[PDB]
Tab-separated table of N, CA and C in Angstrom:
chain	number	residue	atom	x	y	z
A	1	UNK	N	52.097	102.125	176.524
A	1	UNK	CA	52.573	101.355	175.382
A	1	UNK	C	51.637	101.519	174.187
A	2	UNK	N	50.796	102.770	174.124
A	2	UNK	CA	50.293	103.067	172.756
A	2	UNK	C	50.000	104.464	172.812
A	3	UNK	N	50.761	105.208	172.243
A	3	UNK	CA	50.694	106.781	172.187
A	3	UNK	C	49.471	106.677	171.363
A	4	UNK	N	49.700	106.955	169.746
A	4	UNK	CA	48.229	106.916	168.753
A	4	UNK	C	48.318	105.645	167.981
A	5	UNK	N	49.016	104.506	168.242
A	5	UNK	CA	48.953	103.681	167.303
A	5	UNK	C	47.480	103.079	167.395
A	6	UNK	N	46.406	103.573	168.326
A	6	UNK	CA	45.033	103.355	167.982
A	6	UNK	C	44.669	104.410	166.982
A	7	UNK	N	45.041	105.852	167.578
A	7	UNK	CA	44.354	107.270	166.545
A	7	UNK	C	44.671	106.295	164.989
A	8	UNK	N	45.285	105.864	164.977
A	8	UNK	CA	45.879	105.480	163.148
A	8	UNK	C	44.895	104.417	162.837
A	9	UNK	N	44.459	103.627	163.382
A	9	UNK	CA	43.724	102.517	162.985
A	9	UNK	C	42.400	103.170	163.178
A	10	UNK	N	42.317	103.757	163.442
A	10	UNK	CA	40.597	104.614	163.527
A	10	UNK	C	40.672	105.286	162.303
A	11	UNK	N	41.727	105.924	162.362
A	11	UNK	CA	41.595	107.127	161.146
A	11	UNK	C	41.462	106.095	159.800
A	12	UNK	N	42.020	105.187	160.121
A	12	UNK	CA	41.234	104.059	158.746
A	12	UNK	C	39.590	103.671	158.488
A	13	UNK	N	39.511	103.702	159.629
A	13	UNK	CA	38.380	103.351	159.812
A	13	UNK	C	37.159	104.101	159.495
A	14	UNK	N	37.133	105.359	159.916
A	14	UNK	CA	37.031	107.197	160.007
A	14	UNK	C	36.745	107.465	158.176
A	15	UNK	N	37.628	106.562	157.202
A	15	UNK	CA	37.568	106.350	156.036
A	15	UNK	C	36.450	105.673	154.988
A	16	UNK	N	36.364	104.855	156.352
A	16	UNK	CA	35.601	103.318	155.858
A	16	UNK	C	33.935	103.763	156.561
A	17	UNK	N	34.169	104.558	157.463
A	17	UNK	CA	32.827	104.904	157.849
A	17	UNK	C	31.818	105.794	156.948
A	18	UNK	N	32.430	106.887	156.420
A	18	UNK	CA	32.119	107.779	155.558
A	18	UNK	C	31.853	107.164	153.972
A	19	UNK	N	32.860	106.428	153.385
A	19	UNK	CA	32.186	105.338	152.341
A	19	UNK	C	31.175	105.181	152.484
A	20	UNK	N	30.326	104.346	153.341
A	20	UNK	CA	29.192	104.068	153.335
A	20	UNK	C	28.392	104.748	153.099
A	21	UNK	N	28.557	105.732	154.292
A	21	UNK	CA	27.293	106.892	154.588
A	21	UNK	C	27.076	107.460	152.962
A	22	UNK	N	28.331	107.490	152.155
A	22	UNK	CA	27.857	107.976	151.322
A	22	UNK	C	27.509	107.543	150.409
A	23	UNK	N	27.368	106.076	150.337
A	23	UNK	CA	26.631	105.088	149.662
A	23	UNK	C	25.247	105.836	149.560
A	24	UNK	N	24.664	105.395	150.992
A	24	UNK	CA	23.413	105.483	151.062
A	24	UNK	C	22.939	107.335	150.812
A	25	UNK	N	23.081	108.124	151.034
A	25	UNK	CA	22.939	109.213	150.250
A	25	UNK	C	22.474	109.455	149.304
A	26	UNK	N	23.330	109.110	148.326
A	26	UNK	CA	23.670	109.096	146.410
A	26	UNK	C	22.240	108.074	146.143
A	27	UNK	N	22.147	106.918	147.132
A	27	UNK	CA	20.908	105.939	146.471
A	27	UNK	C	19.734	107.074	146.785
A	28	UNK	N	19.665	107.523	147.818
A	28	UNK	CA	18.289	108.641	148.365
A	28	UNK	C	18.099	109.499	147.240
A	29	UNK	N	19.471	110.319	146.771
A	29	UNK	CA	18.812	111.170	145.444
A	29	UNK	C	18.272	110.481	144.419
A	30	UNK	N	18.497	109.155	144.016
A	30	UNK	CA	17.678	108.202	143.399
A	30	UNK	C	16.101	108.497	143.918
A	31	UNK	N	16.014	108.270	145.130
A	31	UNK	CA	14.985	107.701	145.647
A	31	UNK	C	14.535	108.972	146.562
A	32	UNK	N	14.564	110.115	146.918
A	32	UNK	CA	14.374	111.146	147.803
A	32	UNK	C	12.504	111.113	148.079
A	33	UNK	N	11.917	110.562	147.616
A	33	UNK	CA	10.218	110.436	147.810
A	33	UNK	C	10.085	108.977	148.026
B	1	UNK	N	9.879	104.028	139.038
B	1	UNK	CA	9.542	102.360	139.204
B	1	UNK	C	10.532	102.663	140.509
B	2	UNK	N	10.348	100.737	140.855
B	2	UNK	CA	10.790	100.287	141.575
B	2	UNK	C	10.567	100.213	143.151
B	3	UNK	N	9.704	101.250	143.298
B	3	UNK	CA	8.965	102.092	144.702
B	3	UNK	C	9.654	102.311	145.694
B	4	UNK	N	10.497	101.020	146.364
B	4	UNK	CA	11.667	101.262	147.248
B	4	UNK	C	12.820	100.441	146.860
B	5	UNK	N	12.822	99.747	145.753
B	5	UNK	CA	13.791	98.579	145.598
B	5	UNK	C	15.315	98.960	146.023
B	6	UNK	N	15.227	100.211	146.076
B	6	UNK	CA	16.119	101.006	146.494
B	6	UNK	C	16.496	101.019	147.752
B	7	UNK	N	15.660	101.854	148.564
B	7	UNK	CA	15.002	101.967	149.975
B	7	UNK	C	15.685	101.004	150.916
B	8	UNK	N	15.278	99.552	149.628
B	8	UNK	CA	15.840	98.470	150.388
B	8	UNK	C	17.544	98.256	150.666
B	9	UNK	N	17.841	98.797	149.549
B	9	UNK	CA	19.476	98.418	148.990
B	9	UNK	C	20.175	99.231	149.583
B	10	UNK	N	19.509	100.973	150.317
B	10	UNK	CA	20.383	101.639	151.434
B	10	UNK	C	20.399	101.259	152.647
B	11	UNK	N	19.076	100.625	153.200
B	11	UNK	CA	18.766	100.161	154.651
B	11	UNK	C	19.888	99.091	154.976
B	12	UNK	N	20.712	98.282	153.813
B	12	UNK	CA	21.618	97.247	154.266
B	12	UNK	C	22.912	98.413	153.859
B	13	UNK	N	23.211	99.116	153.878
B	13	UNK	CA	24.231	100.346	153.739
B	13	UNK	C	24.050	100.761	154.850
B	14	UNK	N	23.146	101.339	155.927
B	14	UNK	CA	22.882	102.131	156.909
B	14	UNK	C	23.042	100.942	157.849
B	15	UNK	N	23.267	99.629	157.756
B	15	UNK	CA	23.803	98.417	158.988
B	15	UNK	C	25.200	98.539	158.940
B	16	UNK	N	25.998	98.803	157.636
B	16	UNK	CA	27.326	98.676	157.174
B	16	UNK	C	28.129	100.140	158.027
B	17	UNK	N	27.153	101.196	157.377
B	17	UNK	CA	27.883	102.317	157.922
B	17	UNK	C	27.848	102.214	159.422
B	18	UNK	N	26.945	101.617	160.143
B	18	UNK	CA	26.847	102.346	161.953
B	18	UNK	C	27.754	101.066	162.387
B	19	UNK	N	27.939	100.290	161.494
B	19	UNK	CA	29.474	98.879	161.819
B	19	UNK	C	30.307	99.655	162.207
B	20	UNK	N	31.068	100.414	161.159
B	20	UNK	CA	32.286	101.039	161.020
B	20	UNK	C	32.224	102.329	162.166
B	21	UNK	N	31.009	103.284	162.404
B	21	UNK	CA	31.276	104.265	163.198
B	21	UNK	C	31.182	103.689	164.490
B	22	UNK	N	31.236	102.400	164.862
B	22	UNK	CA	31.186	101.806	166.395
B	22	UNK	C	32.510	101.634	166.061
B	23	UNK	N	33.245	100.998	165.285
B	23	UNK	CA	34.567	100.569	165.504
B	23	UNK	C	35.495	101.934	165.897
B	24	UNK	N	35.090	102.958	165.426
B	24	UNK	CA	35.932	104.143	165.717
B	24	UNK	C	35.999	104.553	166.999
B	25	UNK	N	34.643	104.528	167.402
B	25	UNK	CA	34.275	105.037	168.700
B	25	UNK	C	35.046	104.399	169.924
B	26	UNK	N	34.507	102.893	169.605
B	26	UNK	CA	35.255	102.016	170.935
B	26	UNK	C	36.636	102.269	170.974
B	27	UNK	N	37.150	102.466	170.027
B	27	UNK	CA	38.808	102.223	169.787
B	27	UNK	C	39.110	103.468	170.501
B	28	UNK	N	38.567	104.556	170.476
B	28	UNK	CA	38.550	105.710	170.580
B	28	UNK	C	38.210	105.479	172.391
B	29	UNK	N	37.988	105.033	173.032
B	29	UNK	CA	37.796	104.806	174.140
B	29	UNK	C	38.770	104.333	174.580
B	30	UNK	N	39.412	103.733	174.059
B	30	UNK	CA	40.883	102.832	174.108
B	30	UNK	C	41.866	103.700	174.491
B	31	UNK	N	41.549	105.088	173.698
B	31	UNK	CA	42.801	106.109	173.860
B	31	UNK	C	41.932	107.526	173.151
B	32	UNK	N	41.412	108.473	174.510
B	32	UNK	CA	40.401	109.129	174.273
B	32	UNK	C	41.386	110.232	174.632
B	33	UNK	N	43.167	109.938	175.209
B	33	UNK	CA	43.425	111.164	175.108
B	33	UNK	C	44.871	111.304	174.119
């Protein structure tokens, strides 16, 4: 009773994970030392 | 300036991001095939 209707709610998520990461990145080239 | 004021402002980004890549994962356990 769930083929991918999880894969779909991840792949949101999968979205929301990568946002971040690339938050913190972009602040490091600020700050790389 | 600022020395890490920064430093600080990714370290609460790097709690946010490893939130979201657990939610993928577990779910992903849910339905790993």
């Amino acid at each position: 009773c769930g083929g991918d209707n999880i894969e779909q709610k991840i792949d949101d998520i999968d979205h929301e994970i990568a946002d971040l990461q690339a938050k913190r990145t972009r602040l490091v080239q600020q700050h790389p030392r």
